[PDB]
């Protein structure tokens, strides 16, 4: 399978556009947070279907499949959020009916810090002019590189997605030096996505413990498993 057709499969694995079905309304501490958790739970369901569409993922042992998704889910959610917000500076496009900014993050202690991190990393991807195909590969790599008979197969798959990202970049027609430079800049931003997701999980766990937000069955399981 060529890098081009592997990227086509990632395009085909892409989850649908998700809405929370919320009537436009000023956000408050309670509605904002219930909206974020309600959205994450819905996106998690589609994330599972997405991963199974990545060629070879279902051939991994069940234990590896579960382990990869339990560790990278918040990062994959945030990477998706950044792509969606790339053409909307100053905004975080969680969904069509859930567009949030900074002064709205102020309404909940500890959220503003996370919104600022998300906004800054998004701005970085915007400056690099992240392309859709690059986003597809990076997102898949976050899943496959979140590892912390089947193991061998995982390495083959990660190498395949890496080969595809390299192909996407070579296709842009820029100089070889510029291609390596771009490859490095994109990969390095992953640490920033990882950082934001780690703070995102820390905040959610505290909200679960305080029962401030209803924690949706799958979201809760994914949260507890990851934390554990």
């Amino acid at each position: 399978l060529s890098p081009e057709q592997l990227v086509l499969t990632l395009l085909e694995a892409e989850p649908p556009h998700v809405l929370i079905s919320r009537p436009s309304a000023p956000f408050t501490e309670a509605s904002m947070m219930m909206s974020l958790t309600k959205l994450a739970d819905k996106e998690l369901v589609h994330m599972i279907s997405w991963a199974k569409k990545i060629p070879g993922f279902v051939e991994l042992s069940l234990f590896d499949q579960v382990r990869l998704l339990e560790s990278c889910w918040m990062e994959v959610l945030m990477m998706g959020l950044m792509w969606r917000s790339i053409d909307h500076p100053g905004k975080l496009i969680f969904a069509p009916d859930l567009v949030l900014d900074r002064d709205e993050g102020k309404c909940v202690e500890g959220i503003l810090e996370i919104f600022d991190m998300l906004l800054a990393t998004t701005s970085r991807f915007r400056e690099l002019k992240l392309q859709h195909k690059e986003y597809l590969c990076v997102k898949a790599m976050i899943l496959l590189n979140s590892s912390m008979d089947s193991s061998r197969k995982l390495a083959h798959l990660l190498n395949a997605v890496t080969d595809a990202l390299v192909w996407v970049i070579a296709k842009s027609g820029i100089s070889s030096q510029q291609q390596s430079m771009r490859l490095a800049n994109l990969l390095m931003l992953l640490s920033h996505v990882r950082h934001a997701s780690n703070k995102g999980m820390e905040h959610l766990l505290n909200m679960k413990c305080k029962n401030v937000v209803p924690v949706y069955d799958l979201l809760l399981e994914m949260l507890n498993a990851h934390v554990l």
Partner: peptide, 10 residues
């Protein structure tokens, strides 16, 4: 088992 149910059904 919620993650596992979804990983084994379509």
């Amino acid at each position: 088992h919620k993650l596992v149910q979804l990983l084994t059904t379509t």
